[PDB]
Structure 1
Amino acid sequence: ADLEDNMETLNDNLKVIEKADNAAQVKDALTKMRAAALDAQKATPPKLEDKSPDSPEMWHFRHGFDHLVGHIDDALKLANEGKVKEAQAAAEQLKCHCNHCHQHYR
C-alpha cells in the first residue's frame, strides 16, 4: 500500500465505525485503521523530501501520525471493553487529527 491507499483505508473505516453498532465491528475497523496509519507513519512525503528528518516540519508531520496511532489505540481499548458508543465517539474525534495534518501539508 502507498500513501493514497493508506488514506483511503482510514477514510472508509471511519464510516464503517459510524455505521456499526457492535464492539466486534468497531474493533475490526479500528484495527484496519491502525495498520494503515502505521504503514504511512514513517515515509517522508513528497512536499518535505528536501527538509531534514529532524526539521520542525518533518517532526510535526511524524508526530501527526504517532498521535493518530495513539488515539486509535485508545479507541481500540474502549472497543475491547465492549464500550461500543464510547469507542464510536473516540473514532469520530479522530477527524481532528486528519484535518490538522491535511491543513499543515496542503
Structure 2
Amino acid sequence: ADLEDNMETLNDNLKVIEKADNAAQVKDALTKMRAAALDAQKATPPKLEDKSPDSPEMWHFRHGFDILVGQIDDALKLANEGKVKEAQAAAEQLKCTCNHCHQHYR
C-alpha cells in the first residue's frame, strides 16, 4: 500500500488498541500496525530533500520503522501474555516514535 494508506492503518489501529476490551482486539490491531510499518519502511518520504536511497536521511527514515516495530513487538508480547492493560500502555509509548519521524518533515 502507499505511505498514506499505511499511516491511516497505523493511526486507526492505535485508536483501536486504546479503546479495546480484550486481547484479541489488541493483538489484531498490533499485527496490522506491524505490517503497515514494514510496508511504509520501503517507501520514500515525500518531503525529503535528498531522496538518494543511501542518504543518512533515508536510513534514519527506515530506522524509525525498525524502532517502531520493536516497540510494536514489545506490546505484542504483553498482549500475547494476556496482559491487556500493560500492552495498551506499551502501545501508547509508540506515539513519540511516530512524532519523531513526523518532525523531520515539519
Tell me the TM-score normalised to structure 2 length.
Answer: 0.92
Inter-CA distance 35–92: structure 2 relative to 1 (3 Å threshold)? same
SS at structure 2 position matched to 1:21: coil
Q: Distance in 1 between matches of 2:3 and 2:49?
A: 15
Q: Distance in 2 between matches of 1:35 and 1:11?
A: 13
Residues 48-77 of structure 1: per-residue CA shift (max 9 Å, x gap): 374332222111111111111111111111
SS at structure 2 position matched to 1:47: coil
The runs of at least 4 consecutive aligned structure 1 residues that moved more than 6 Å come to none
Inter-CA distance 84–71: structure 2 relative to 1 (3 Å threshold)? same
Residues 28-56 of structure 1: per-residue CA shift (max 9 Å, x gap): 11001111111111122233374332222
Inter-CA distance 4–51: structure 2 relative to 1 (3 Å threshold)? closer
Structure 1: stretches of 5+ with no match in the other structure: none
Question: Which protein is richer in helix relative to its size?
Answer: 1
Q: Distance in 2 between matches of 1:43 and 1:4?
A: 10
SS at structure 2 position matched to 1:48: coil
Percent identity between the two aligned chains: 97
Q: How many residues align?
A: 106
CA RMSD of aligned residues (A): 1.3
Q: Distance in 1 between matches of 2:47 and 2:8?
A: 20
Structure 2: stretches of 5+ with no match in the other structure: none
Query: Shift of the alpha carbon at 1:24?
Result: 1.0
